[PDB]
Design an enzyme around this catalytic site. Structure first.
Site: not given
Lengths: 309, 319
Positions: B112, B189, B192
């Site tokens: 992050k 694969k 989402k």
């Protein structure tokens, strides 16, 4: 009348600086407002994990504040860890807290996650009870401002859910002339044995002035402590003794000794009663936790709506 | 003698075919001979979003989905994280034993900070909460993904710290990285992220769209089709036994049926396979109190173990 919330340090031994400096004023304010006060025993864990010592420190802190005149009927007085709500609000306030805010904090700046994080936990204690005013010292001012910052961050996001707290801020001299403070080890403790009190009062630093001559009371630490225990007439009579000559600093210590015993005799006795029958202490603390748990449970319900619990 | 296995289930996102044939079926089947604890991790969700109305229904949806796919509240311990509040307190305590560098080096935070983005205290601290989750229940095994293992190492370090100081308070936990890939609509694969999923709990319309999106060669309608390369066949295999799958390649290698028809077949296969789950799903959300009773039961079992553990802790910290 505004809501005033004070966290109370369980760690250590209360001294007469604490008394005439913070506590006495706070004890006399219990009439003009419903004060909230808590032994922050959660924060105590950042600096120690000796349980048995921590436990005792809390009972002893409890009894000490009661005997110095906290009235659990007038005010709301409790042990922090008895109201576990604050723990979950802590977690929620974290999500609204930028790292930078904490990095720039000062008790950390000046290293465990407990220590880094405790300002958020503090904001939780403040915010949980819609505190208007947090009585602090300079050292703790930016903690209050950090809670206020978190509050603004949450309000922007959720609407005004939190009151914005505001920090509110004459020296008791210690044994060496400096501000009396545990860290300077220059204190005269309130709940100590007569033997220990005599030792502390003996360490008071004095002039070299000879027993026979006039002594300067304006700069004497003994006289400055004594001032706390006497009105204008008793202060005049002791000043006359300084000037007259013929009594040593040692005689004055004996006098300060008796002044300090007499002044705290009742608080000391009440303290010991509280610790000899600790089931009564528990009950007083349980009774305070109930009032606080009721305010806390009700703020939480509103938080839960916002966060989805 | 089955050691305790503990799994945090993310409340966000739509469950799909991969989530099931990939992880969930194995977890559901482990229930019998394993000792499984599974919770809906709704405290962690709070770091991503502070939108309460969404968070609540994601939590519910999540709980209803897993129950539907075969989590058995009677064989397992299954609960919503926030129903077992002891965990927050343990989180405070473990912070006192948690060195800063252990968190400054946590991937989630590091990465992050690298992108240049600012980080919440929550994001920084979540590893300690996670470690409280693990350690509160004397977890032996934490089933983990190939990259998630740092989390378990963090709990393992906090555990040692505390035990060094207070004696045998914690069982040291161990990652068990789990063992075939589920192909997404696009050949890749299924995940989402890739937008190549076939969701389990969707409308008939949404399933049809997703299935119809599956990509294929231009092998003409009448000609034999290479099953060994088709994504429709790859996915259809998950719903079909031996004779079922052979029965089907016979259809491929005979020519005569086109991919449009095989897509129609695939639809009926997925719809049938998940029908009982979908109907169970809908009841749990439509009648929110059967859901509540089950999560309360789960919370009750978790809470007893957490309380026995906090009792130990309370001795050592003076509460």
């Amino acid at each position: 009348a505004m809501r005033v919330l004070t966290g109370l340090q369980p760690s250590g031994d209360l001294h007469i600086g604490n008394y005439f400096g913070a506590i006495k004023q706070m004890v006399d304010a219990q009439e003009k407002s419903q004060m909230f006060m808590f032994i922050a025993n959660y924060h105590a864990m950042t600096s120690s994990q000796d349980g048995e010592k921590l436990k005792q420190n809390s009972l002893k802190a409890a009894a000490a504040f009661l005997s110095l005149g906290i009235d659990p009927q007038k005010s709301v007085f409790w042990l922090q860890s008895d109201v576990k709500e604050v723990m979950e609000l802590y977690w929620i306030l974290s999500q609204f807290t930028p790292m930078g805010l904490l990095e720039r904090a000062h008790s950390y700046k000046d290293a465990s996650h407990g220590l880094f994080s405790y300002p958020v936990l503090m904001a939780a204690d403040i915010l949980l009870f819609d505190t208007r005013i947090v009585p602090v010292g300079k050292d703790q001012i930016q903690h209050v401002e950090i809670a206020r910052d978190i509050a603004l961050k949450v309000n922007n996001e959720w609407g005004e859910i939190f009151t914005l707290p505001e920090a509110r801020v004459a020296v008791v001299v210690g044994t060496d002339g400096a501000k009396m403070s545990k860290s300077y080890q220059n204190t005269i403790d309130i709940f100590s044995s007569e033997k220990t009190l005599k030792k502390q009062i003996s360490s008071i630093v004095t002039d070299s002035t000879a027993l026979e001559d006039p002594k300067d009371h304006e700069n004497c630490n003994i006289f400055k402590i004594a001032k706390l225990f006497l009105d204008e007439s008793g202060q005049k009579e002791l000043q006359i003794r300084y000037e007259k000559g013929g009594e040593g600093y040692g005689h004055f210590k004996i006098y300060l000794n008796e002044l300090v015993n007499a002044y705290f005799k009742e608080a000391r006795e009440k303290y010991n009663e509280l610790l000899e029958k600790p089931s009564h202490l528990k009950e007083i603390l349980d009774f305070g936790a109930t009032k606080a748990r009721k305010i806390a449970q009700e703020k939480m319900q509103k938080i839960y709506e916002k966060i989805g619990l």
